[PDB]
Amino acid sequence: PSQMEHAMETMMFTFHKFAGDKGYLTKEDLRVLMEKEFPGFLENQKDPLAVDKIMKDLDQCRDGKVGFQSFFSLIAGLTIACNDYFVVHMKQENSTVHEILSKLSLE
Amino acid sequence: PSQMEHAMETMMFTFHKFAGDKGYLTKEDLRVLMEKEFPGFLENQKDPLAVDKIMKDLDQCRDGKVGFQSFFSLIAGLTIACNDYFVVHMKQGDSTVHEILSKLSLE
Amino acid sequence: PTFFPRFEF
Amino acid sequence: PTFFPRFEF
């Protein structure tokens, strides 16, 4: 079982953790997901409506429901942002990721 | 030090760890990446030149270089495929992702 | 905006 | 083929 395989299971599991049997996420589920998995990210997002704006920009998501693919769309967004930053403003990682996420805001 | 956060770090780290200083993955880097990070997958890939096929598809693979973004494509491809299979065919105990990647083959 | 590959089975 | 959001800073 790879580090990579584990990363993938984590992604799947996290989604399901929060979605529950119904199989998608609403704003509420998503909100709490982020609060727990991306701590501080939303607070430091200098915004009250932040999570709402996010949904709108997710892959396919204008009916309150978020699929795994929509969700993964979010990961892609964050991760890439992290990397583009990491690539620029540093070169070390033996969290750093936690530190970068704090600097990021949406468009 | 969150858990999604670790997962993202793993992802970033792995790309960079195999890519090395040049910043990208060649078909060789990628083959070994997959040899270590998706152990049984490529072996059980019943086409013996699956890596070639996968490399040939990768979004920006045309200079033979593989961006992080491209690399992420691959993760999305696998994860989402895993998830779809998971939800239809099963719906914790680790070693499942590992077992799903086994049944997975390219288009 | 990214395009991924499709794995079946 | 998957659209994703763009985070800056």
From Swiss-Prot, chain A:
GO terms for biological process: membrane raft assembly; mRNA transcription by RNA polymerase II; positive regulation of exocytosis; positive regulation of focal adhesion assembly; positive regulation of GTPase activity; positive regulation of plasma membrane repair; positive regulation of plasminogen activation; positive regulation of stress fiber assembly. Residues 59-70 are annotated as: Ancestral calcium site. There is a cross-link at residue 36 (Glycyl lysine isopeptide (Lys-Gly) (interchain with G-Cter in SUMO2)). SUPFAM superfamilies: EF-hand (SSF47473). Keywords: Acetylation, Isopeptide bond, Ubl conjugation. GO terms for molecular function: calcium ion binding; calcium-dependent protein binding; protein homodimerization activity; transmembrane transporter binding. The modification N6-acetyllysine is found at residues 22, 27, 36, 53, 56. Pfam families: S_100 (PF01023). One of its GO terms (cellular component) is plasma membrane protein complex. InterPro entries: EF-hand-dom_pair, S100-A10, S100/CaBP7/8-like_CS, S100_Ca-bd_sub. The keyword Acetylation applies. Does not appear to bind calcium. Contains 2 ancestral calcium site related to EF-hand domains that have lost their ability to bind calcium. Heterotetramer containing 2 light chains of S100A10/p11 and 2 heavy chains of ANXA2/p36. Interacts with SCN10A. Interacts with TASOR. Because S100A10 induces the dimerization of ANXA2/p36, it may function as a regulator of protein phosphorylation in that the ANXA2 monomer is the preferred target (in vitro) of tyrosine-specific kinase. This is Protein S100-A10. The gene is S100A10.
Curated annotation (Swiss-Prot), chains C, D:
It comes from the Eukaryota. Expressed in brain, heart, kidney, liver, lung, pancreas, placenta and skeletal muscle. Transmembrane segments: none annotated. It is found in: Cytoplasm; Nucleus; Nucleus, Nucleolus; Nucleus, Nucleoplasm. Has both helicase and E3 ubiquitin ligase activities. Possesses intrinsic ATP-dependent nucleosome-remodeling activity; This activity may be required for transcriptional activation or repression of specific target promoters. These may include the SERPINE1 and HIV-1 promoters and the SV40 enhancer, to which this protein can bind directly. Plays a role in error-free postreplication repair (PRR) of damaged DNA and maintains genomic stability through acting as a ubiquitin ligase for 'Lys-63'-linked polyubiquitination of chromatin-bound PCNA. Interacts with SP1 and SP3 independently of DNA; the interaction with these transcriptional factors may be required for basal transcription of target genes. Interacts with EGR1; the interaction requires prior binding to DNA and represses c-Rel via a DNA looping mechanism. Interacts with GATA4. Interacts with PCNA; the interaction promotes polyubiquitination of PCNA through association with the UBE2B-RAD18 and UBE2V2-UBE2N ubiquitin ligase complexes. Interacts with RAD18, SHPRH, UBE2V2 and UBE2N. Belongs to the SNF2/RAD54 helicase family. RAD16 subfamily. Subject to frequent epigenetic inactivation by promoter methylation in colon cancer. This is Helicase-like transcription factor. The lineage of its organism: Eukaryota, Metazoa, Chordata, Craniata, Vertebrata. The gene is HLTF. The chain holds residues 31 to 39 of 1009 of the full protein.
